[PDB]
Amino acid sequence: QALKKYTIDLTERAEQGKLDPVIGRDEEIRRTIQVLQRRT
Amino acid sequence: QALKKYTIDLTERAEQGKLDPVIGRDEEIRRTIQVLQRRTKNNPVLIGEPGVGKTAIVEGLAQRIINGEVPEGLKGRRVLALDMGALVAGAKYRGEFEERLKGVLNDLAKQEGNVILFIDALHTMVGAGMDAGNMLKPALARGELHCVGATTLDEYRQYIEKDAALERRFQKVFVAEPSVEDTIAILRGLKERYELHHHVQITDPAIVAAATLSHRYIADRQLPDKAIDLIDEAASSIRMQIDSPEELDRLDRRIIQLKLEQQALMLDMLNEELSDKERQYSELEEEWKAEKASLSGTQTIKAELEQAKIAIEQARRVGDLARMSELQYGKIPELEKQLEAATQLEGKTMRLLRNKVTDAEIAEVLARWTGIPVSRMMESEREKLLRMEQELHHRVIGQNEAVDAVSNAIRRSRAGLADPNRPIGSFLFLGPTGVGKTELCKALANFMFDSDEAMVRIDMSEFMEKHSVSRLVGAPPGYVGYEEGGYLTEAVRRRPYSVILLDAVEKAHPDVFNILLQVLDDGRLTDGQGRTVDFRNTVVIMTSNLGSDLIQERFGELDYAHMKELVLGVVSHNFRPEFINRIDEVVVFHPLGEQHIASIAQIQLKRLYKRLEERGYEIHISDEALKLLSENGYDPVYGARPLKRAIQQQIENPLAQQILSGELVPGKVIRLEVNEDRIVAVQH
Amino acid sequence: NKVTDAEIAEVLARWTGIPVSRMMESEREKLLRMEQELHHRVIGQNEAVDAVSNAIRRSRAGLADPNRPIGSFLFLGPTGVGKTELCKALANFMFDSDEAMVRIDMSEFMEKHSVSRLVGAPPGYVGYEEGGYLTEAVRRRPYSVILLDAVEKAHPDVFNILLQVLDDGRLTDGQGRTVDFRNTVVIMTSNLGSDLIQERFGELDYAHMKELVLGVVSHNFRPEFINRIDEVVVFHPLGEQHIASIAQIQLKRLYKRLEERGYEIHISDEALKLLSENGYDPVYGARPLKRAIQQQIENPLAQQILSGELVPGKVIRLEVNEDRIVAVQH
Amino acid sequence: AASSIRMQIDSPEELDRLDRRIIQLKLEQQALMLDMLNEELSDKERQYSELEEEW
Amino acid sequence: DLAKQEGNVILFIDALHTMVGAGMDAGNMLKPALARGELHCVGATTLDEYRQYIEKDAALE
Ligand SMILES: Nc1ncnc2c1ncn2[C@@H]1O[C@H](COP(=O)(O)OP(=O)(O)OP(O)(O)=S)[C@@H](O)[C@H]1O
Ligand SMILES: Nc1ncnc2c1ncn2[C@@H]1O[C@H](COP(=O)(O)OP(=O)(O)OP(O)(O)=S)[C@@H](O)[C@H]1O
Ligand SMILES: Nc1ncnc2c1ncn2[C@@H]1O[C@H](COP(=O)(O)OP(=O)(O)O)[C@@H](O)[C@H]1O
Ligand SMILES: Nc1ncnc2c1ncn2[C@@H]1O[C@H](COP(=O)(O)OP(=O)(O)O)[C@@H](O)[C@H]1O
């Protein structure tokens, strides 16, 4: 499949715990998801 | 086959129903249809300032073509869109671009006029590395190609209307910026679309209020797109607040705290407390799940009704007849009444919060956009405004008349009662210098709007000059500081709701009052760049001090009214009456008694003890020293600025002289006890 | 299937915006009614009613000059006699808004060399890509009434620009294209002879009024520039029935905004009488009326709204106090 | 103007206004479904049919 | 793949300007997929590339 050919899963990396639990910015992530669950 | 390679059928997508039944504009739709159905020059262009959805106007044209609302010369056409950038894939080699374009044109010649071309952003065809208009031009004079132009008026008169041939291949269709009620009707259609999409409910009076406040205040975007985006933003905000759950997270943190505590312990009763709080959390969570199941059932049965609408529109396009009757008479009224039964079931069961959006939520989103509370008179800020004078007299000693006047202005503002076409209030301030005119404006913006800073001071003793006026407006174009904007204006347009101080205008040249005439009649001002920025949602204030001699004479035992009248006659000697008639509202400040000096000094002690607790110091005072300072810091000409400098020269220097002598320990009781002429601090 | 000249005039009107079409009967009724409507929303000043009625009649009948632009009017009157509001009522008739007008606020222009605000900047300076705002706003709305506000505050001979405008009204803009004014209307407002007006609106007719203030403004302007104007009309300081009518109109739009708030508000006519007693002065015209209305109505009214006395669905008779007005809830 | 006249031929205006009238009366009758609105619908549809046949 | 995963996958692309400058060279192939909604990707750059590429195509804006 063409998925694995040219993609990099970061969610696998945090799923395999490779990554950095940075603290904070939760309002900004919230406003991001506010954008993310729009229609336009 | 480049049509397969580069273009996308809208009418496939509208055949798939993917787009908007866009309301209105119907004369312009028809006029588009007129210009299309000619024999030559078949390509009209769409024009305006953006955020009006001309894209969607082409979409609705295609949807009417699907529905056959067109004359009998377009039934069966092909409305296809193409980017100019779509053929800038490989722009190095020679003719490659042009070979793509000619292959497109030969495809369209082979399709023989049954295809209507759409182009968005027609100015993308202007300059592309001659290039592009020098191939379309024979088709576009000959009308064999069926282009549809849609672009922004700035790019129109910037790119095309300086290139004359491309101007004469096209005809203007000026879409207006829509009205209020047009916005309302389209937002009813969009209420439909969003409650189809965003899984929620919307209040339609909140929608028309949202449209009202969007058109009314924010001039940044334009109609109707700003209200569209606001409704989308509020819908998604409440949509995230569907899976917020705040009280569930409170209970979950509580039960996990009690679980950690019990696991640390292993009299107990903590097991019982954990069991009770977990039962509470489980009950709240189960109510949450029941609400989610209710909303999910409501949205699914709404989607099933929408698919029934899709099928009955398939019967409208195709033309089965008993299918229409069957789908209507079965599906519509029973699904509507059980959708309303689910709606009133939610109106029963929704506690953990909503799925509606109200105008309070609109004003929340608005303040998150604006920063300005028109989040309405909610009996906290409202009852602040009911105590607004008593708010001010934290810092406003005496002087109650202007306090009344200012609070009157604010009340006429934030209750929404003003004629908003003048500004919020024009003001002349009079009276003795060194009372807190600046304090008044600071406390105004403080307990009204932000703070003691959210303002613009403009000191008018600079402004003895014609070129001073040239500064504060903005320079004329074809001069130096054109490219930067005016002094006042861009600072206004960043902070749309401020209070502007024009202090001491009597030192300025009398020319300035013309600029104030345009403002204080109108609240709109035309800058260097020829454009106009609103004031009318701000507050403008001038100060003067001329007959403060006469005030210091006669405020002892004359009234307020004839005092006002006499000093306004003096102002008529000063200004033009043609300007002060444009002035709304004038006060007089009066000289204070020394009790007011003592009170302001108490306020200075308050902010001093604030500063020293910020240093860490717990300091009190003998008030005989306050009596001495009240004896010291006055003149009849300046008043309180002598008190401020005396506070400095007898407090801020020697107390720091002893702190940096290492005498003073934070936390000790430090009485500012008197001396013969000085103040001693103690270490207790 | 026969194409007539009315078809062409409508296609032109919809294709540009200029109201070319032959005088249909709703429009002609509306023109007689707009004579009436400018009596309505402008109480007072029926000289101006006459003048601008004649202006738009010489427009829409299609008889006035295809050389000169259509009207040309240098208004004279003292403060607040409705001049700006006259032209806004013209637009709100004609364009169903106030925000379809060219309101070039003229008192910015106190030194000379901001003419480039209105023309554009000549090539090889800054504003060559942008124009000057008058020309752009004309060429987008080719039928639009242009107002030039309080015009004599400026440096005096800015209006060689307006010598072109009122002469032939092709306007050579910055870049070098033609800004044509033949379907438009230029209005100025000035308050020069206003002290003579309030001095001598009595003891003169309309004509010697016009004569003497024309002599004065001719001392102010240049004799070139007075020759270009169609009719130098004069305004008059208003009597107290006009004051009462203005008060009524302000009450109606006040009622409008508060019924948009959602409140049914009446008044004592004695309260109107108190307003009429508390709004008259010859020297200042209409604004002491309006701000007296503002204070002595709105501030107790907004106070009681922020009290929450005002329940909707109640007739709110603005009845008098001893000297003031209370709102009642019945 | 030529294609404008062609579309005003190809539309028709008052015929489609009467068509809006008859479809509104059909909706109103089915919202009622004494009647006599059936008779009024038949009258307006006969009017529209005569106009359409003339068209 | 954007068609296949049906919006269950939202990919991430930082350096949105590098999608703008990639040779439609990459961007306006995907302005369909973001406009149509097979992808809801997240941008990450500085204000200068915002004014340089994101503001400069107003459709991208
Ligand atoms: N009648 C309508 N019904 C539904 N949505 C509409 C309607 N008119 C406009 N819109 C929406 O308004 C949005 C923004 O307007 P646009 O037409 O896209 O702006 P524009 O002026 O065309 O410039 P662009 O390049 O298209 S953003 C559209 O994408 C539509 O979703
Ligand atoms: N006949 C009238 N009908 C309606 N409103 C009027 C009338 N006469 C005066 N007004 C009011 O008077 C004010 C006039 O506003 P403006 O025209 O801007 O003032 P002005 O006429 O420009 O006076 P100056 O000389 O420029 S200060 C408005 O508030 C009008 O409502
Ligand atoms: N809370 C955090 N947890 C883990 N890593 C972090 C955190 N905060 C910052 N970093 C590190 O800081 C670096 C910043 O890089 P990045 O944020 O990707 O650049 P940019 O700020 O341009 O996006 C990252 O490589 C990341 O590993
Ligand atoms: N009403 C008041 N409430 C609180 N403090 C005030 C008040 N009036 C005056 N002050 C004091 O008066 C001084 C006056 O400052 P400023 O406003 O610049 O002078 P003026 O009032 O003469 O323009 C301030 O420094 C402040 O310490």
PDB file of C-alpha atoms in Angstrom, chain C residues 38-216:
ATOM      1  CA  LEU C  38     -37.875  65.733   1.635  1.00  0.00           C
ATOM      2  CA  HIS C  39     -40.561  67.803   3.226  1.00  0.00           C
ATOM      3  CA  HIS C  40     -40.904  64.851   5.618  1.00  0.00           C
ATOM      4  CA  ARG C  41     -37.441  63.952   6.785  1.00  0.00           C
ATOM      5  CA  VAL C  42     -36.210  67.470   6.412  1.00  0.00           C
ATOM      6  CA  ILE C  43     -38.587  69.749   8.150  1.00  0.00           C
ATOM      7  CA  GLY C  44     -37.665  73.315   7.412  1.00  0.00           C
ATOM      8  CA  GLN C  45     -35.754  74.632   4.468  1.00  0.00           C
ATOM      9  CA  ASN C  46     -38.121  74.240   1.591  1.00  0.00           C
ATOM     10  CA  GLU C  47     -35.857  76.404  -0.557  1.00  0.00           C
ATOM     11  CA  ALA C  48     -33.581  73.379  -0.575  1.00  0.00           C
ATOM     12  CA  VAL C  49     -36.533  71.114  -1.220  1.00  0.00           C
ATOM     13  CA  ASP C  50     -37.279  73.228  -4.284  1.00  0.00           C
ATOM     14  CA  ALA C  51     -33.686  73.370  -5.477  1.00  0.00           C
ATOM     15  CA  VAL C  52     -32.793  69.728  -5.237  1.00  0.00           C
ATOM     16  CA  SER C  53     -36.216  68.775  -6.545  1.00  0.00           C
ATOM     17  CA  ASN C  54     -35.412  70.851  -9.607  1.00  0.00           C
ATOM     18  CA  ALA C  55     -31.982  69.229  -9.788  1.00  0.00           C
ATOM     19  CA  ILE C  56     -33.246  65.696  -9.946  1.00  0.00           C
ATOM     20  CA  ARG C  57     -36.092  66.696 -12.230  1.00  0.00           C
ATOM     21  CA  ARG C  58     -33.575  68.139 -14.683  1.00  0.00           C
ATOM     22  CA  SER C  59     -31.813  64.833 -14.260  1.00  0.00           C
ATOM     23  CA  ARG C  60     -34.449  62.207 -14.767  1.00  0.00           C
ATOM     24  CA  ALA C  61     -36.433  63.965 -17.418  1.00  0.00           C
ATOM     25  CA  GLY C  62     -33.163  64.161 -19.323  1.00  0.00           C
ATOM     26  CA  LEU C  63     -32.972  67.810 -20.223  1.00  0.00           C
ATOM     27  CA  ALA C  64     -30.042  69.345 -18.344  1.00  0.00           C
ATOM     28  CA  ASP C  65     -26.618  69.674 -19.715  1.00  0.00           C
ATOM     29  CA  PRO C  66     -24.593  66.839 -21.216  1.00  0.00           C
ATOM     30  CA  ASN C  67     -21.652  69.165 -20.666  1.00  0.00           C
ATOM     31  CA  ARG C  68     -21.918  70.340 -17.052  1.00  0.00           C
ATOM     32  CA  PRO C  69     -22.576  67.929 -14.206  1.00  0.00           C
ATOM     33  CA  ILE C  70     -26.089  67.863 -13.118  1.00  0.00           C
ATOM     34  CA  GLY C  71     -26.464  70.001 -10.080  1.00  0.00           C
ATOM     35  CA  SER C  72     -23.944  72.298  -8.479  1.00  0.00           C
ATOM     36  CA  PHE C  73     -24.827  73.704  -5.087  1.00  0.00           C
ATOM     37  CA  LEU C  74     -22.992  75.867  -2.605  1.00  0.00           C
ATOM     38  CA  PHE C  75     -25.181  75.766   0.483  1.00  0.00           C
ATOM     39  CA  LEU C  76     -25.312  78.610   2.903  1.00  0.00           C
ATOM     40  CA  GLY C  77     -26.735  78.386   6.382  1.00  0.00           C
ATOM     41  CA  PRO C  78     -25.846  78.422  10.049  1.00  0.00           C
ATOM     42  CA  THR C  79     -25.142  75.515  12.227  1.00  0.00           C
ATOM     43  CA  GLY C  80     -27.150  72.366  12.300  1.00  0.00           C
ATOM     44  CA  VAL C  81     -29.942  73.336   9.995  1.00  0.00           C
ATOM     45  CA  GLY C  82     -29.858  69.891   8.426  1.00  0.00           C
ATOM     46  CA  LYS C  83     -27.468  70.298   5.513  1.00  0.00           C
ATOM     47  CA  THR C  84     -25.624  67.026   5.877  1.00  0.00           C
ATOM     48  CA  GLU C  85     -28.920  65.450   6.793  1.00  0.00           C
ATOM     49  CA  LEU C  86     -30.482  66.896   3.648  1.00  0.00           C
ATOM     50  CA  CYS C  87     -27.943  65.173   1.468  1.00  0.00           C
ATOM     51  CA  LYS C  88     -28.244  61.981   3.459  1.00  0.00           C
ATOM     52  CA  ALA C  89     -31.993  62.065   2.994  1.00  0.00           C
ATOM     53  CA  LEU C  90     -31.343  62.462  -0.707  1.00  0.00           C
ATOM     54  CA  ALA C  91     -29.231  59.359  -0.715  1.00  0.00           C
ATOM     55  CA  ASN C  92     -31.608  57.410   1.506  1.00  0.00           C
ATOM     56  CA  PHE C  93     -34.250  58.197  -1.024  1.00  0.00           C
ATOM     57  CA  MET C  94     -32.147  57.538  -4.038  1.00  0.00           C
ATOM     58  CA  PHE C  95     -29.763  54.778  -2.998  1.00  0.00           C
ATOM     59  CA  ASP C  96     -31.708  53.486   0.031  1.00  0.00           C
ATOM     60  CA  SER C  97     -28.784  54.220   2.382  1.00  0.00           C
ATOM     61  CA  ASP C  98     -26.481  56.927   3.524  1.00  0.00           C
ATOM     62  CA  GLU C  99     -23.461  54.790   2.652  1.00  0.00           C
ATOM     63  CA  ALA C 100     -23.780  55.409  -1.058  1.00  0.00           C
ATOM     64  CA  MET C 101     -22.381  58.901  -1.270  1.00  0.00           C
ATOM     65  CA  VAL C 102     -18.983  60.430  -1.679  1.00  0.00           C
ATOM     66  CA  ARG C 103     -18.527  62.298   1.548  1.00  0.00           C
ATOM     67  CA  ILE C 104     -15.136  63.881   1.141  1.00  0.00           C
ATOM     68  CA  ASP C 105     -14.643  65.611   4.444  1.00  0.00           C
ATOM     69  CA  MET C 106     -13.155  68.845   3.315  1.00  0.00           C
ATOM     70  CA  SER C 107     -11.669  70.391   6.420  1.00  0.00           C
ATOM     71  CA  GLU C 108      -8.598  68.114   6.313  1.00  0.00           C
ATOM     72  CA  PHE C 109      -7.291  70.273   3.558  1.00  0.00           C
ATOM     73  CA  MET C 110      -6.178  73.300   5.466  1.00  0.00           C
ATOM     74  CA  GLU C 111      -2.878  73.389   3.733  1.00  0.00           C
ATOM     75  CA  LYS C 112      -2.813  73.147   0.001  1.00  0.00           C
ATOM     76  CA  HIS C 113      -0.946  70.154  -0.976  1.00  0.00           C
ATOM     77  CA  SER C 114      -3.278  67.384   0.063  1.00  0.00           C
ATOM     78  CA  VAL C 115      -5.082  67.660  -3.252  1.00  0.00           C
ATOM     79  CA  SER C 116      -3.332  64.402  -4.058  1.00  0.00           C
ATOM     80  CA  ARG C 117      -5.681  62.835  -1.558  1.00  0.00           C
ATOM     81  CA  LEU C 118      -8.418  63.378  -4.062  1.00  0.00           C
ATOM     82  CA  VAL C 119      -6.709  63.177  -7.451  1.00  0.00           C
ATOM     83  CA  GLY C 120      -3.918  60.672  -6.964  1.00  0.00           C
ATOM     84  CA  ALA C 121      -0.291  61.090  -6.867  1.00  0.00           C
ATOM     85  CA  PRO C 122       1.597  62.073  -9.966  1.00  0.00           C
ATOM     86  CA  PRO C 123       3.785  59.391 -11.432  1.00  0.00           C
ATOM     87  CA  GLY C 124       7.052  58.844  -9.741  1.00  0.00           C
ATOM     88  CA  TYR C 125       5.817  59.560  -6.294  1.00  0.00           C
ATOM     89  CA  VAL C 126       4.095  57.258  -3.849  1.00  0.00           C
ATOM     90  CA  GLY C 127       0.452  57.041  -4.763  1.00  0.00           C
ATOM     91  CA  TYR C 128       0.615  56.043  -8.357  1.00  0.00           C
ATOM     92  CA  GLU C 129      -0.721  52.525  -7.995  1.00  0.00           C
ATOM     93  CA  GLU C 130      -3.712  53.563  -5.919  1.00  0.00           C
ATOM     94  CA  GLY C 131      -5.331  56.715  -7.276  1.00  0.00           C
ATOM     95  CA  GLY C 132      -6.937  59.473  -5.278  1.00  0.00           C
ATOM     96  CA  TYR C 133     -10.057  58.415  -3.469  1.00  0.00           C
ATOM     97  CA  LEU C 134     -12.489  60.726  -5.238  1.00  0.00           C
ATOM     98  CA  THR C 135     -11.678  59.271  -8.613  1.00  0.00           C
ATOM     99  CA  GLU C 136     -11.946  55.637  -7.572  1.00  0.00           C
ATOM    100  CA  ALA C 137     -15.209  56.113  -5.751  1.00  0.00           C
ATOM    101  CA  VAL C 138     -16.644  57.948  -8.734  1.00  0.00           C
ATOM    102  CA  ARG C 139     -15.642  55.352 -11.235  1.00  0.00           C
ATOM    103  CA  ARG C 140     -17.170  52.536  -9.244  1.00  0.00           C
ATOM    104  CA  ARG C 141     -20.545  54.236  -8.733  1.00  0.00           C
ATOM    105  CA  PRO C 142     -20.941  56.380 -11.859  1.00  0.00           C
ATOM    106  CA  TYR C 143     -24.263  57.542 -10.594  1.00  0.00           C
ATOM    107  CA  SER C 144     -23.509  58.777  -7.093  1.00  0.00           C
ATOM    108  CA  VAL C 145     -24.114  62.048  -5.328  1.00  0.00           C
ATOM    109  CA  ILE C 146     -20.964  63.636  -3.963  1.00  0.00           C
ATOM    110  CA  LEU C 147     -20.985  65.779  -0.859  1.00  0.00           C
ATOM    111  CA  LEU C 148     -18.170  68.130   0.089  1.00  0.00           C
ATOM    112  CA  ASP C 149     -18.529  68.981   3.730  1.00  0.00           C
ATOM    113  CA  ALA C 150     -17.988  72.432   5.306  1.00  0.00           C
ATOM    114  CA  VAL C 151     -15.798  73.269   2.459  1.00  0.00           C
ATOM    115  CA  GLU C 152     -14.406  76.705   3.239  1.00  0.00           C
ATOM    116  CA  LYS C 153     -12.330  75.574   6.169  1.00  0.00           C
ATOM    117  CA  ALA C 154      -9.636  74.551   3.737  1.00  0.00           C
ATOM    118  CA  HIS C 155      -6.949  76.483   1.971  1.00  0.00           C
ATOM    119  CA  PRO C 156      -8.877  78.689  -0.456  1.00  0.00           C
ATOM    120  CA  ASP C 157      -7.827  77.718  -3.953  1.00  0.00           C
ATOM    121  CA  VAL C 158      -8.064  74.000  -3.719  1.00  0.00           C
ATOM    122  CA  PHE C 159     -11.066  74.334  -5.919  1.00  0.00           C
ATOM    123  CA  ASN C 160      -9.396  74.831  -9.217  1.00  0.00           C
ATOM    124  CA  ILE C 161     -10.018  71.110  -9.036  1.00  0.00           C
ATOM    125  CA  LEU C 162     -13.620  72.036  -8.672  1.00  0.00           C
ATOM    126  CA  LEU C 163     -13.305  74.512 -11.535  1.00  0.00           C
ATOM    127  CA  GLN C 164     -12.649  71.489 -13.764  1.00  0.00           C
ATOM    128  CA  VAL C 165     -15.391  69.593 -11.996  1.00  0.00           C
ATOM    129  CA  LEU C 166     -18.135  72.114 -12.372  1.00  0.00           C
ATOM    130  CA  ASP C 167     -16.951  73.255 -15.778  1.00  0.00           C
ATOM    131  CA  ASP C 168     -16.785  69.977 -17.667  1.00  0.00           C
ATOM    132  CA  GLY C 169     -16.216  67.315 -15.109  1.00  0.00           C
ATOM    133  CA  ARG C 170     -13.838  65.169 -16.959  1.00  0.00           C
ATOM    134  CA  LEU C 171     -11.184  64.789 -14.281  1.00  0.00           C
ATOM    135  CA  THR C 172      -7.656  63.972 -15.360  1.00  0.00           C
ATOM    136  CA  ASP C 173      -6.698  61.689 -12.540  1.00  0.00           C
ATOM    137  CA  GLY C 174      -3.178  60.825 -11.448  1.00  0.00           C
ATOM    138  CA  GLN C 175      -2.414  57.960 -13.793  1.00  0.00           C
ATOM    139  CA  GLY C 176      -3.857  59.739 -16.805  1.00  0.00           C
ATOM    140  CA  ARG C 177      -7.354  58.420 -17.367  1.00  0.00           C
ATOM    141  CA  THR C 178     -10.598  60.346 -17.435  1.00  0.00           C
ATOM    142  CA  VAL C 179     -12.958  60.716 -14.540  1.00  0.00           C
ATOM    143  CA  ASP C 180     -16.261  61.908 -15.963  1.00  0.00           C
ATOM    144  CA  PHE C 181     -18.893  63.566 -13.832  1.00  0.00           C
ATOM    145  CA  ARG C 182     -21.747  64.008 -16.232  1.00  0.00           C
ATOM    146  CA  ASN C 183     -24.194  61.805 -14.383  1.00  0.00           C
ATOM    147  CA  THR C 184     -23.307  63.121 -10.938  1.00  0.00           C
ATOM    148  CA  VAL C 185     -24.085  65.930  -8.532  1.00  0.00           C
ATOM    149  CA  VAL C 186     -21.749  68.151  -6.493  1.00  0.00           C
ATOM    150  CA  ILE C 187     -23.004  69.803  -3.308  1.00  0.00           C
ATOM    151  CA  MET C 188     -21.087  72.017  -0.961  1.00  0.00           C
ATOM    152  CA  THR C 189     -22.091  73.363   2.435  1.00  0.00           C
ATOM    153  CA  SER C 190     -20.693  76.588   3.841  1.00  0.00           C
ATOM    154  CA  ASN C 191     -21.503  78.623   6.900  1.00  0.00           C
ATOM    155  CA  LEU C 192     -19.879  81.922   6.079  1.00  0.00           C
ATOM    156  CA  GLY C 193     -22.709  84.427   6.106  1.00  0.00           C
ATOM    157  CA  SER C 194     -24.509  82.708   8.922  1.00  0.00           C
ATOM    158  CA  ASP C 195     -24.179  85.536  11.404  1.00  0.00           C
ATOM    159  CA  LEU C 196     -25.618  87.823   8.759  1.00  0.00           C
ATOM    160  CA  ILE C 197     -28.335  85.201   8.240  1.00  0.00           C
ATOM    161  CA  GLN C 198     -29.388  84.988  11.880  1.00  0.00           C
ATOM    162  CA  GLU C 199     -28.938  88.740  11.912  1.00  0.00           C
ATOM    163  CA  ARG C 200     -31.030  89.301   8.807  1.00  0.00           C
ATOM    164  CA  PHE C 201     -33.197  86.357   8.025  1.00  0.00           C
ATOM    165  CA  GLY C 202     -35.715  88.837   9.251  1.00  0.00           C
ATOM    166  CA  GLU C 203     -36.341  92.146   7.446  1.00  0.00           C
ATOM    167  CA  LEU C 204     -35.385  90.699   4.030  1.00  0.00           C
ATOM    168  CA  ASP C 205     -36.924  88.534   1.353  1.00  0.00           C
ATOM    169  CA  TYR C 206     -35.271  85.475  -0.062  1.00  0.00           C
ATOM    170  CA  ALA C 207     -33.703  87.445  -2.880  1.00  0.00           C
ATOM    171  CA  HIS C 208     -31.863  90.237  -1.064  1.00  0.00           C
ATOM    172  CA  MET C 209     -30.736  87.597   1.404  1.00  0.00           C
ATOM    173  CA  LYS C 210     -29.202  85.738  -1.526  1.00  0.00           C
ATOM    174  CA  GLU C 211     -27.790  88.958  -2.977  1.00  0.00           C
ATOM    175  CA  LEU C 212     -25.986  90.138   0.129  1.00  0.00           C
ATOM    176  CA  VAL C 213     -24.572  86.767   1.092  1.00  0.00           C
ATOM    177  CA  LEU C 214     -23.519  86.245  -2.522  1.00  0.00           C
ATOM    178  CA  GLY C 215     -21.539  89.464  -2.323  1.00  0.00           C
ATOM    179  CA  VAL C 216     -19.941  88.213   0.890  1.00  0.00           C
TER     180      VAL C 216
END
